[PDB]
From a paper:
An unusual set of Francisella regulators—the heteromeric macrophage growth locus protein A ([name])–[name] ([name]) complex and the DNA-binding protein pathogenicity island gene regulator (PigR)—activates FPI transcription and thus is essential for virulence.
A previous study suggested that another small molecule involved in signaling, the inorganic polyphosphate hexametaphosphate (hexaMP), binds the [name]–[name] complex.
Author numbering:
A (entry chain C): 0 to 194
B (entry chain A): 2 to 204
The structure:
């Protein structure tokens, strides 16, 4: 009905957790519905390709992973989910890409190869180092690389969610990160998405 | 001052595209061909500010951004005038999707063909894989341009995906790949499309 938009989503899928975190942020009247709890006939009606986070309103239907979130932030402008300062915004637009490209794959590779425990033992050891050396490199800022909530945070929020559901958890032994994660999960956006 | 530094390499279709947008903006920018041995000095630099001497790279005092989309967006922030994108958030996204297609299909493949260790069978396949989806592609790029132009006749923005493709034809022509089309005015369009002034100025 009046559900201006509806977001169809899969469970344990960052791409869908990213979208739900930002739609909450936009105080939007949207219907949310799951897959697996749909007719094998309609799932193909809305998104013919099994891509899965799919946002559809009256006369448009979208799911392009790398483009969806930018669209939400643009379609429902207030509140803005990008920086105001040109330069900041410019490099957030880059950190986004690096994220989607160098970090999200580590996720799949923690899953697709997860039915084996000797590989995991090492991968978790890597994700350990890769963060260990940055947990210092970033500090003194409320959220990620900005003053306020960015898409970048939506990205990371969701990513962490999936990883700690793989068994990868962030401890007291990272630092400004653990509390940055604490702050992340402090937000009413991230909390209705985690449960 | 406006110390914008664009790192490039000769015949690198990405660079050529960023170089022709910057022209349109009227942005002042020190272009830097890293292929040229005079700039051994800047190439040393680049490999400090990018994980893999990425090209092209748009460097300023505050940042060093690479990757086409990021760059193209980056320029839109910096030099708003004239507009590179549509304005309706639906059409903006569509172009973002299309640009991501044209890229994985022609833009990066164009770059594989420039490697001197490509295995004679490899490319023939690349080229022909390219020939298949190019016309359909062009046709998509137009349709969308007819839409966005008509949805706002007063906006008067440029179609970045039309510019980008002009280059994909110019490299089809550079690599001796045929453009399979009989259609009269498609070829008329193509020819005119390569005859737009700033394109020449870029080359």
């Amino acid at each position: 009905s009046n559900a201006m938009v509806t977001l169809y989503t899969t469970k344990y899928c960052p791409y869908s957790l990213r979208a739900r975190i930002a739609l909450a942020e936009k105080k939007m009247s949207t219907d949310i519905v799951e897959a697996g709890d749909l007719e094998p006939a309609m799932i193909k009606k809305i998104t013919p390709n099994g891509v899965f986070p799919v946002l559809m309103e009256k006369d448009y239907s979208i799911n392009n992973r790398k483009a969806l979130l930018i669209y939400i932030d643009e379609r429902f402008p207030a509140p803005s989910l990008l920086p105001n300062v040109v330069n900041e915004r410019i490099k957030i637009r880059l950190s986004l890409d690096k994220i989607d490209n160098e970090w999200y794959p580590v996720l799949d590779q923690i899953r697709k190869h997860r039915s084996d425990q000797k590989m995991l033992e090492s991968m978790f050891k890597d994700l350990k180092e890769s963060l260990l050396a940055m947990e210092k490199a970033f500090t003194g800022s409320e959220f990620f690389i900005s003053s306020g909530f960015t898409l970048a945070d939506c990205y990371i929020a969701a990513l962490i969610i999936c990883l700690e559901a793989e068994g990868f958890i962030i401890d007291d032994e990272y630092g400004a990160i653990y509390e940055y994660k604490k702050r992340l999960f402090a937000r009413d956006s991230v909390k209705k998405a985690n449960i | 001052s406006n110390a914008m530094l664009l790192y490039t390499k000769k015949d690198d279709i990405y660079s050529d595209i960023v170089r022709m947008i910057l022209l349109i903006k009227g942005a002042n920018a020190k272009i830097v061909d890293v292929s040229k041995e005079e700039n051994s000095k800047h190439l040393e630099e680049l490999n400090i500010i990018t994980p893999n001497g990425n090209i092209p790279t748009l460097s300023t005092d505050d940042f060093a951004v690479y990757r086409l989309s990021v760059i193209i967006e980056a320029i839109e922030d910096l030099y708003p005038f004239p507009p590179m994108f549509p304005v309706f958030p639906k059409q903006r996204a569509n172009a973002r999707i299309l640009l991501e297609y044209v890229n994985k299909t022609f833009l990066q493949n164009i770059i594989k063909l420039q490697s001197p260790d490509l295995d004679e069978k490899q490319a023939n396949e690349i080229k022909m894989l390219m020939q298949r989806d190019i016309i359909s592609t062009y046709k998509k790029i137009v349709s969308e341009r007819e839409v966005n132009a008509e949805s706002n006749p007063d906006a008067q923005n440029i179609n970045v995906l039309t510019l980008i493709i002009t280059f994909v034809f110019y490299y089809f022509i550079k690599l001796k790949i045929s453009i399979p089309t009989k259609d009269k005015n498609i070829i008329k369009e193509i020819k005119e499309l390569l005859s737009e002034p700033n394109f020449i100025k870029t080359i």
